[PDB]
Symmetry: D3
Subunit: 240 residues, 6 copies
């Protein structure tokens, strides 16, 4: 409940020094963080329960890996990303999440690697004095994730996503965004890419298409299978 302590004091994360690995996966839902830690990591322990925003650390192929819930939207993920980087020395951050497709050639359960993110957040207009900053993924993470997707034979589109402030927007103008190549909507990536660049860290978002503005029915097994593939891409990207 302190507001003016500084990000290096990380008041939203109750972890001791060292409990968070240099490489971290960022689902939005803390219950997905627990699923990832229990399903894919060895020896996972919980290091944070503040606000119920669970985070865990364990190992994957002998490399230390953390998984931290972020909440929804640019202001929530910006709190957690600032604290992870400035307080815990995190250097590689892979967001794993969903998105809503707006392109006719993108299908539900396709996996998208966000090369960059458009946004209607004000955060960068206020930093850059009204000019246009392009939040952009780390190229080597992106290229690595792409190569792993190839090894696994996945349907993998690479392009721009749109980071919305307003999940419920009366005037999204999706026809305009789609005309200019935007693949899908989500709510966090522009902030992740901007703050990772600010502090010299490496960031990527690996996203599953969970809805389409035009289209498609799926089952629970189907969803869990695609989720597992996205997590495996992220983990390999993190440790290579």
């Amino acid at each position: 409940n302190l507001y003016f302590q500084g990000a290096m004091m990380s008041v939203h994360i109750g972890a001791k020094a060292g409990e968070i690995a240099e490489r971290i996966l960022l689902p939005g839902d803390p219950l997905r963080a627990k699923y990832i830690a229990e399903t894919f990591l060895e020896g996972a322990v919980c290091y944070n329960e503040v606000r119920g925003m669970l985070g865990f650390t364990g190992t994957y192929k002998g490399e230390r890996i953390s998984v931290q819930g972020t909440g929804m939207g640019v202001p929530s993920i910006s709190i957690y990303v600032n604290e992870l980087i400035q307080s815990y020395g995190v250097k590689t951050l892979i967001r794993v999440g969903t998105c809503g497709a707006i392109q006719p050639d993108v299908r539900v359960r396709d996996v998208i690697l966000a090369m960059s993110a458009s946004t209607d957040s004000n955060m960068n207009r206020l930093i850059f004095r009204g000019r246009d900053y392009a939040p952009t993924a780390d190229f080597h993470l992106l290229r690595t994730a792409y190569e792993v997707g190839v090894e696994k034979g996945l349907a993998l589109k690479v392009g721009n996503v749109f980071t919305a402030d307003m999940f419920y927007n009366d005037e999204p103008n999706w026809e305009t965004w789609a005309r200019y190549g935007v693949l899908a909507v989500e709510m966090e990536t522009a902030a992740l890419y901007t703050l990772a660049a600010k502090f010299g860290c490496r960031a990527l978002s690996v996203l599953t298409v969970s809805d389409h503005i035009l289209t498609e029915e799926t089952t629970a097994e189907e969803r869990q299978m695609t989720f597992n593939e996205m997590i495996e891409v992220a983990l390999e990207a993190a440790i290579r």
Copy 2:
């Protein structure tokens, strides 16, 4: 199922059955504070939502049905929950309870603030009003009731403008400028709550406890507990009157 293109009336972030949520609701940011409020102040409280861990509860206070729902942090998070509560569950009275950071020399830690309005650096309203200035404003009658309840309990209750921040960590908040024009404290949700409540003809108020000061007093766990309890009672009374 992570659907993006259902309308708010389908409330995909809230797992409650129709009718499980009361028309009056308290909105702490922290789902663990929702659980504390429900267990401490409400009779017969039942959990209606665990989606994303963002707990919500319904119970009764002085014979009235009351819910209490975590919102998460920031304008985008609370705007999801408020849209769904209003458009899917028929919520009509929405009281945010939480903390804020004072930026005024004469506002003290543990003061309770009633936000009469909220400034912001969110883009949400610039995009709605094509670049003009909308003033997000509390419901007058809730605000007046809460103030009077505070008088009944001999409380302070400062009343004025708060600033809804997008960036908890901001390199350029210019707090001197905001303080100069009378902003009392920083928080991260009220501008969206007040705007959406006005949009749908609902009544909203934020009742906030000062938990930090840009220029400073330390406090005890018990002191914070009793001020917290006092904030909740003001909000609960404001909801049922």
Copy 3:
């Protein structure tokens, strides 16, 4: 006709020190300031005639009260309010005027207490470097005027919109109404911002004189509602 002297010099108000009470009513029409001063005040003296912008000081229930015309619009009232606060030490400022309603349940002759003011003026975007400041009334003034209106059995409380452009081709009134705006006028946002800046108490008490929908009264109707508005304002100022 100076431009680069400070507000402590009172460029536009030809009074000298002490002639202006700490409580002031601000109609927009100077002829209406004269009316208020004669009709409601005991002992009304005219302290200003610069530009015809009449201002008067008198007594009401034994309290000193001034009444000062502002012009029309944010730049005009900003001149007078800066000089009133920074030159003459005015502490309590209550605007009284008319507004055009844009809500179906608000009727002509209803009285509005402006809790806050939206605007399309650039004044605050330029102060807060593009961010959103909410100009807001003093709460104790607002609450006082509300109880007075109740004691006298009258009163809607909410947001008004301060327009720069009386004649606007694109006002988008349906959007402002959707988000609760009650009525349009042209001064309150500047008053609430400047009052907060200098730690003064401000409030707008407004009478609906027109409606977007009904397009709308007798002379006797307008003046009776007007006097009720003044009575609320005078009361709020002295309590």
Copy 4:
């Protein structure tokens, strides 16, 4: 006190048809409109006293000419100019007033012809959806007034800045001066924009009454320069 009637209804000007000439001078002070009407016009009749905003119609060299007070600032002059053009058929509109100089080579009592007007008003950003409109004088009016000033041996021609905020904590005058702005006033941008909108001819003739640097005269000096400005304006209107 109507709000939602069109400008063809002349809400703020209590004249009837034909009482206002097609050529009009626009001082900002209504008391100064009265002065102009008596001192320079033959047969001056007062056609308006709404809000004290006096307006007069008379003759000069056998041509009908009106003189109408505007208030201070873009919203005020916009009200009067809309009604003058759309109700009364005014075609030629010449503002006369003062300004504060921000250039070292411009001196108090110099007369400025405003070729164009910069501004910090939001009026045009909201019309042109954030793009940059340049409010500009009618060239033939500008050229005429320039030749008259020469015939009479007086005159700087350039850009002025129309301010919303007479009292501005952050005017950044060094930046505007670097880019050639001559002086600050508070109305010309709105006049030039509205004149162009309705196909009318407009011009501001301004007297420097203050300087950012010299901070600056006798009463006899101010009034003699003033009369010269009026003489230029009257001449430009009728030629």
Copy 5:
């Protein structure tokens, strides 16, 4: 050598020796039009610049030294050349000559326009004046001279505002709105020319021939040639008086 961080005074885009450029200069957009003007109207014209093919020439007109320099298209291109001409070569009088597209019913193809000012959708001045409205404006005395020269030749010469576009191909120009407020014609450079000329205390004017109309007349090669020649003579006379 493609240096980005030398100051304008080093004029890396212009290969002229010190003094090879006259204090008075005509600025067509097209380097081939610069060459035509120099060879047709100037005595003793010599080429001083071929960097990027953006030809510039110096010669004499009626015993006065005059240069003529291609600018390229758009605010960023002309702003490079104008900064370097002013800050490196001491240019003081700058007359743009070129074409424009009319958007007014009463402006006709082959009319010659003197731009008294220029509207724009460039961001250049929003960023200089922190979001306020600067009006780029011609030098009054050049404008007046050109008008009078046009009278001497019995020419039309319309005088008013032009719009400096960033986007020759724009899906949303809103020409009806601009025409409503009196914009005569579209071009792509004048706002930058007038702003930079004011910045450095120089005198600038744009003299433009209407070459197209949003609502329409066809013309002959000879007709375009004689109107072109007439535009150049007005600009040359305006430069040396």
Copy 6:
């Protein structure tokens, strides 16, 4: 000199139908277009002399390739790119050019592949109603260029560039742009990437660092050698 004819009538390019290849290189300087066409292409012919903005078509490894000068700045390149795409059916556009580095670890003669471009142009703020669009390279062109740079052992950085309207800017704020990862300044890429995305075309900028805001002296031979390497990367990217 027509203003209202429509981009498909391409009034700035005097080429007959078919004279321009589907794959094109875009130097800014028309004299560099002539150098590229004479040095690297077989059978090159000039198809445009309008405004002196030379363009050429020839062959490289048996594939048809064009080279077209663009002028300086977003408004100039936007005219040529609109006409090439809408009138001549160009589908793959590689800008080859220079840039001014602002990062201390980027050296003069390094080759930069622009993953995305920041800008202070107003063009996208006016299209997207004041929101933030991120102009982004085609991933497969980018990845291909990267791989070719590897085959050749070049010093190849991949990241964001800044597209300036004002070569001479009194307030560039380069410290802020550099803090957020911007590698270098140039004047065209944001427009190229936005218009290529609008029309479903593939675009990339391959840029040589020719100046540094902090630092380095070079020779003519050095410059020509690095220029040749950048052109070879672009040509391979275009035809693979």
